[PDB]
């Protein structure tokens, strides 16, 4: 037996969970600008709800058959049906159970907007979300991806792509982000075997990309014009870009005739988000699944993303390791200290006055410590500021305060002392 | 063939808007707390191998073929855990999930701070119950006292009385039944339990009835019976301490020596301590036996801490704030941006973008003209404070109509100073 922390986890470090707080704010914090509410389901639901082979399912043990949520919109279908709601505008930001062998347990983090309004408002109100948190992160300059459902099926179609393969050609054009094409085209006569024909036909579209103009251009596009499907689609996405443009962030997305993720989830509108030199942020419209948990049948329209956090985490971490920043663990202002030997009494007299003040300050669990610890405890901790009480100073109502940085002691009067340290500080 | 239903596994319940509201305010009031005190936080996995756990109340998964794990039912486990992967004496951590017990709630938030490391006497200790006054206080349910005992004490003052050690462990499972019941109930359970002698029983009567703060302690001092027992008067001392202490802290009023307080007696060596509303509330103490055994080298690592019944607390201030008769918000949405015209929708996204982007609250709604009259009603229902009103007039003016929800009143306020004046009616 090795103590071990089961395969596909880890702990978070205090470091590393002060890492996922600095994070986690700048989420919430824009999400809570957005009006969401807040829901939380259990860890796990009835195998039953998650079935109608990479979800970890619990031993019988003589109850029910359960399974852990892979997913956080199964719970919130769940969730909405359970509680007859037509409409909802929440976010959710809790760990996920995929038994994968390539995390096994890790952060997933969406916002949605389930409810029935007029088109693209939602989706849009989506986008700007994920550029308001994805420049507050400072994580570098990104591009999001946009894609539409009705799209791909129209075109595949208008190209001449059979059904059988359609779901596993499309899913040939979505490693194009990372591959090039005349390694994909090839990968497209071996895995299925399009026609030289078809092949360039698809390949003609999909290697386009850019803004609102592009948009322009595929209406007007002959080929495109007579099937309704796609027509659709593109209809969408013209309004979609004139809400971004009056949010301001028609700059930072672009229109790809090549993404196609989440292909069983998503109805309309895809989108994935892009660092620049993966998977930061995704999301998009999937009218399909509300709708399936409900008992009569009655569809719920729903939009959302998730932010892929795991992945942010370890960028943020980094940047500041490269930029030497300390990544302090505790938040403590204040070390109370003594150099002469009885003291302690006294010490814990000054803690608590501090403490009851709002001050967060801190001892040594010791009667009797030597000042050249105390002092190393504060530059290692971060600790900005001690507190050094003394026979003489305190026969004068005075406490010194010592600087950990400067080195530079100053006396002050007793009350004083509440001001003057939260001063330092703010 | 099997009715399916929309169930939520047995003894698990959702958190809905306005439960998450309130346990949002309750774990802040906690944390900031801990923070106070210098403490880290850590996160263990919601699973660990099963061998861990083990070495029938515990979730199981299923083989499916790796590992063979269970659901986390501590938060200590996992701390031991911690500290001996991680390698290290001493640290101060917080920890508040979730945790998992197939009862008879089977998932209920624990959150529990502890201060693990070798430090002298009852310093920690002390500056646990700080924190549970700290806390308590600040949630703001009603006044409070929290319990205080010792296991050496127990163990020395039944031994006095002459309680076997077989039957030890259930005598004081009475008497930790005492805070609810009479000792007349206690007493006859003690002689229709295991079968004490009335006068074993008597004997402990005479202690376990008492209580008080400091002076306890100082008479059971002065006892001719206690203090001829090693173990009882180590405690006592202990005691004695640990109020020296809590004067300094100025909590001294607030705690008081219960020798009927025997909870836990598995995990504790040192200090109990349990919180009393005037529940569950809040509870802990010293038990110095459990971080170390998951160490290779047998070396023990002594420890104190506390846990806050989150649980029974989030219920104690939704009533609490049901009956104060106050609105709990699901949402902090300052603004809504509405309109009272017709083809205004485009005017209106350009400016929830404005004060998106200066950070304020804002919100609209989906829909291309609204009526005013049902714009209004979603602000009253969802507690927002106020609408900012564009109209094609008003918008060639450069002008935006404000009206307070509450109060009913407009304020035509120019397009610069809105945001301002917005975030002067906030804060």
Known sequence: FVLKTPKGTRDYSPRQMAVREKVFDVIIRCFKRHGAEVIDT??????????????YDLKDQGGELLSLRYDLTVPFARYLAMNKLTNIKRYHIAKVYRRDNPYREFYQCDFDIA?????????????????????????????????????????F??????????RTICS?????????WEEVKNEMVGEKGLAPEVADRIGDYVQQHGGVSLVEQLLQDPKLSQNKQALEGLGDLKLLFEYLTLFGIDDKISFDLSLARGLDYYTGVIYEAVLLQGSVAAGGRYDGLVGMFDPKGRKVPCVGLSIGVERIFSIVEQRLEALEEKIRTTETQVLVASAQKKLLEERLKLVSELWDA????????KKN??????????????????????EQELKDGVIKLRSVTSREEVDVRREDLVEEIKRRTG
């Open 172 to 180: 040939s054009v979505d490693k194009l982000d990372k591959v090039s």
């Open 358 to 365: 709002g001050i967060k300050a801190e001892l040594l669990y």
């Open 42 to 55: 259990p860890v796990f639901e009835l195998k039953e709800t998650l079935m109608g082979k990479l979800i």
């Open 115 to 155: 409810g029935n309004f007029d088109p693209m408002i939602p989706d849009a109100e989506c986008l700007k979300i994920m550029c308001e948190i994805l420049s507050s992160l400072q994580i570098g300059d990104f591009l999001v991806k946009v894609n539409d459902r009705r799209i791909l099926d129209g075109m």
């Open 157 to 166: 179609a208008i190209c001449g792509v059979s059904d059988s393969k359609f």
């Open 369 to 390: 410590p030597k000042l050249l610890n105390q002092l190393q405890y504060c530059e290692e901790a971060g600790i900005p500021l001690v507190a050094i009480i003394g």
